[PDB]
Phi, psi and omega in degrees: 000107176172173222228103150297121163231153174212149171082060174284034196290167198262294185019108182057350143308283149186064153265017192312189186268321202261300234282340166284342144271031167268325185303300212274322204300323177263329174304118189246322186283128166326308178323285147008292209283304202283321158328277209293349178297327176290306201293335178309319195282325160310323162314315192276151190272165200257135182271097268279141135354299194310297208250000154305347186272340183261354158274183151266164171286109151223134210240040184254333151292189174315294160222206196282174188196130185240147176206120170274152127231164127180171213288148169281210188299282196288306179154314197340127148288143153203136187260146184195122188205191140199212189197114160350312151280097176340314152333258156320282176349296168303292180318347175283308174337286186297349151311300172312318168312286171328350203237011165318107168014068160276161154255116188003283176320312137347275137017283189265000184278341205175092166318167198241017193262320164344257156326314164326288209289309193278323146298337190055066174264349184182302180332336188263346175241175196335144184298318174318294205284341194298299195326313189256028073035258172332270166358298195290326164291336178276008163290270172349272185342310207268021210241288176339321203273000181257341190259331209262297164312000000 
């Protein structure tokens, strides 16, 4: 009798969408955002060897980048990853957000680039960086397309 837990991270616990637009709301400057974004990360806890294996490699960014999920009962998904760059660390947050115990579907129902766009967290940035963005949601896609089959 007993329950193993792990991987406290907040993204939508209380990391929410909103609760980052709250954060952001008086930050108007991208500096800011792109500040405290580096500090998102700091926040996030460092990621263990252990669950770099339960994750994936992705060497597609700014720098390396590790990202876990998988589906539940129901479908709830839950993602847990990080990164080298503080940046890109933070930017998983709000990922992680977007993807609050999302459903594949869901997902492909509503990119998780949104909350990006609409904090403007990746709207501002460069169309280049963007591309790896992209990479990390089409992680998601290809993920949809094994659940969704």
């Amino acid at each position: 009798m007993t329950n193993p837990q792990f991987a406290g991270h907040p993204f939508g616990t209380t990391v929410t969408a909103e609760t980052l637009r709250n954060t952001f709301a008086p930050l108007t400057q991208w500096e800011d955002k792109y500040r405290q974004l580096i500090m998102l990360g700091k926040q996030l806890p460092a990621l263990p060897d252990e669950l770099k294996a339960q994750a994936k490699e992705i060497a597609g960014c700014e720098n390396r980048v590790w990202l876990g999920y998988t589906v539940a009962e129901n479908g709830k998904m839950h993602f847990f990853g990080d990164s080298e760059g503080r940046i890109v660390r933070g930017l998983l947050a709000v990922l992680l957000t977007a993807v609050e115990g999302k459903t594949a579907a869901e997902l492909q129902a509503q990119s998780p680039l949104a909350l990006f766009d609409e904090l403007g967290l990746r709207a501002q940035l460069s169309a280049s960086r963007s591309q790896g963005l992209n990479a990390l949601s089409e992680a998601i896609i290809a993920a949809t397309k094994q659940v969704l089959e």
